[PDB]
Amino acid sequence: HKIPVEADFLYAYSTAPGYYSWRNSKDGSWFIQSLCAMLKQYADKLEFMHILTRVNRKVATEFESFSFDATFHAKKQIPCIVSMLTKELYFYH
């Protein structure tokens, strides 16, 4: 007769716990760039978790940092999908 108060929440983090999150001054953040591209291409075709999975792959494979500072050079990023959802989510019907 009740549901958890924390149920039905989805947290789409740009990066893994404890990690840096990369942003390009001209193109925007790696994550948001990728999220919008995948939503534009798949929102009317795929369930949300699968769209977010494509976002994870796009960020993980197509981006790598470039810095004059060796400390921040050639780094990678993996987004982090945190789901407390109880049903599949489709933006269309």
Binding site: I3, P4, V5, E6, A7, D8, F9, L10, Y11, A12, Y13, S14, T15, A16, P17, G18, Y19, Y20, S21, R23, N24, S25, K26, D27, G28, S29, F31, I32, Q33, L35, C36, L39, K40, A43, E47, E64, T71, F72, A74, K75, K76, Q77, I78, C80, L85, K87, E88, L89, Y90, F91, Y92, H93
Partner: protein, 146 residues
């Protein structure tokens, strides 16, 4: 009627819902935070992307920690009865479990608590999405060649 399954959220309400975008680019000097160049690109991209998904987008720029909490509180107090879901996008500096207002930090938990199933009844049983573009620490991923 025929067999009815409830494997997917009801997304055919009159409205898809709100998409609140908080874009913090300029921070107060005492905070010791730099300007987030290129963040406006993200904000615009998100506005257009969610506009095409039929979300009522509301963009907010450079909000202090107080304004963030007040905004979220006010939004959670709206009547979301005719809305299918809720979306909040946060663009700012951050650390694990924290998002930065222009003048200080805000615990993500404080923001999301306003929307708990027992605190925002018009969203109970509906998907509440929080998209967070911000650091969750300082670790750097060196990656591995494939």
């Amino acid at each position: 009627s025929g067999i009815s399954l409830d494997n997917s959220y009801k997304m055919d309400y009159p409205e898809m819902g709100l998409c609140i975008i908080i874009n913090n680019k300029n921070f107060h000097k005492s905070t010791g935070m730099t300007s987030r160049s290129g963040t406006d690109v993200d904000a615009a991209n998100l506005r257009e992307t969610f506009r095409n998904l039929k979300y009522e987008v509301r963009n907010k720029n450079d909000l202090t920690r107080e304004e963030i909490v007040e905004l979220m509180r006010d939004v959670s107090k709206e009547d979301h009865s005719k809305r299918s879901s809720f979306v909040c996008v946060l663009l700012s500096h951050g650390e694990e479990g924290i998002i930065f207002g222009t003048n200080g930090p805000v615990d993500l938990k404080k923001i999301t608590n306003f929307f708990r199933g027992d605190r925002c009844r018009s969203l109970t049983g509906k998907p509440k999405l929080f998209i967070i573009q911000a650091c969750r620490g300082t670790e750097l991923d060196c990656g591995i060649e494939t």
